[PDB]
Structures are given as C-alpha cells and as structure tokens.
Amino acid sequence: RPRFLELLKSECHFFNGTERVRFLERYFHNQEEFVRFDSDVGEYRAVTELGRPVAESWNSQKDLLEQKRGQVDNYCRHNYGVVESFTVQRRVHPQVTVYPAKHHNLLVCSVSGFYPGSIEVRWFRNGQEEKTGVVSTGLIHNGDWTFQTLVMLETVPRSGEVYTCQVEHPSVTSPLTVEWRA
Amino acid sequence: EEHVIIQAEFYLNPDQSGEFMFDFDGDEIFHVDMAKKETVWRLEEFGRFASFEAQGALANIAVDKANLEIMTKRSNYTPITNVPPEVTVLTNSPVELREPNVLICFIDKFTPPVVNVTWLRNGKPVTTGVSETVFLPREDHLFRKFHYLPFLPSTEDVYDCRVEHWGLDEPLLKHWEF
C-alpha cells in the first residue's frame, strides 16, 4: 500500500555553549518541509505553498508564538544544561593499533572507539611525516557514541625503517603514537 | 556552529506507527518505546544523569497523527516516494581470532522508515545477543539505522546482513567474513 509520512524536527543549535542559540521547528510531509518556526524570525513561515494556510493560522495566535519565542531558553538552553555534562563534555580516547595488510604488506593504522568525531591521524617514516602517501576510510560513525577510522600508509615498508602512526584527538594532550619496526 | 540537539518524531500511515527520539550531534540520547510507553536511553548511564517522562512523547505522536491525516488530504493523497537504502557491514574494531568483536550493519539514506533486517551466520538467522537502533535523522531528511551482532571471529564463519525495503526490488544482502 502507499505510505504517508509526517515528520517534525525541533532543532536547537548552539554556538559557543549557550551564548548564541537558535531554535528551529520544522514540519515535513513525505520528505517535503512545508512550514517552520525560526527563532531568528519569531513567527512561522511557509516553506512551500502547502504551508501557507498553516503559517497564517498559527501566526494569528500570539499565545502560541509567545510560547515558541521562549523555547531558546525554556527548551534549548534548559536541555543543554541537563545533558551537556555527558554529551558536550564526553571524551573517550581512541584505541590505536597498527597491523600489516596484504609479496609486501602495507601498514594500516586502526583508530577506534573514540568520541567526539574530530581527529587527525598522521604517518611518519623514521621521523619524517608521510604527508601525501596516505589513504583513509574517512570518519566512520558506529552509531553508539563512538567513531573509528582506518589510515593506510601506501609506502612499502623497508626492513630497518621505523613507521609511526600519530593520533591527535580532544581526549589527549599529546599525540598518541604506535610504532612499527619493519 | 558547534553542537546541535534535535528532537525528531514521526508518524506513518497506514502502518499506524510512530517514533520519538533526541539526537545530539548525530548520536541518539534516547527514544520512546511507543508500545511500552517508556523512555529508552541509548547508553545505560544516561538514565542516571537525566530523566524524561515518556507520556509527553505519546501526546506529541497523537498530534503528529492528526496533522498527518490533514496534510495527506491537503496534498491530494500523494504517496511518499520510496528511496532504497545503501547497506554497509563492518566491525567495530580490527578482527582477531579469539577476541570478541561486533559486526555492524549500517542502513543509510532511505525512506519511509520501515525495514526488515536479518543477521545470517552460515545461513542461520541470528537473534541472540543482537541489538539495533530506532530510525535516526539525517540533514537531508532520509533515515539511518544501525544493527549489531556481537561475535567471535572464526575462519569458518560467513555473515550476511539481509535488508528488505519497499524501495528495493529484492532483498539486499551484504556479505562479510574473516
């Protein structure tokens, strides 16, 4: 049978903690946003013609608008204060390991289980950074408040040389490194 | 911008099913089990840090349902267009023989929010120890969903994440093996 979907997204955007907050209440019907309330404006605005009658009707209700105009404080800032300690301030250091991958084996640096997602992984060869000989999976979200990424060194390992994977992340004050002695 | 908290909720007809969840920078804080009318925290510890009264979510869904019936009529009963998902199977960490790990089946970029997901190990449906997330939001308004299967690596096992969605003509199977 045909499907009909109604979606509502109430978004709270935070800039520098709760210094600047923007509240957006967005309505979607079958993937099409038709009307929204933006705290920067203070009233509902039709996104498509389908939302014109809705915005017009709701905007004539001062009581409703007054409630929505108070959400940046009563909803956004309130909730931020309630969850910030275990979300905004959540920090889980990454587990770093290096393993060879298949007559030569390229070195792969696995960086997993970390949070937040911002991270920088670099490869070094005997102290010199291999700035352009690296390929990665990019950032992978595990859907459980952790991320991971694989960073492979394209340079063929030479016996005698030392390769080091360096990881910088908000959870550590100095780079985490794993050395591989070829 | 630095952080975003999104309260995402939906109602779907004719399935008569709805969901309600909070998202922080892409991760779920909690959702409400509509059937049990209870608050489900994504990570157990969250429940000792905060509280949410599930009933509020139920009342919201009732309103979304009412809005849906109205908007469906105003849009000439035009049905939603199916967008098939892309599926990726990966492990949460590098695989090692006698060290437990977790297989992740990531279902992405689809709508409507309805899917059948099955884990198969050597052709056997696995329903032991598995877990999954509710339908998560995307900035493009499509959905994301994660399924998990803790396992013990073995050169003798093969795995498949079988996904069904109305946007697909046949089941989509993503294979994985050590």
């Binding site: 509502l8 809705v54 309130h78 | 309260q7 804080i29 509280s51 908007m71």
Partner: peptide, 13 residues
C-alpha cells in the same frame, strides 16, 4: 535533570 520536550502545533482541519 529533566529533559523538556517541544510540542507540535496542531494544524486546523
């Protein structure tokens, strides 16, 4: 402590 929810506007029928 208490997470507060935002309520949907009711579209007129």
């Amino acid at each position: 402590q208490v997470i507060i929810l935002n309520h949907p506007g009711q579209i007129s029928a």
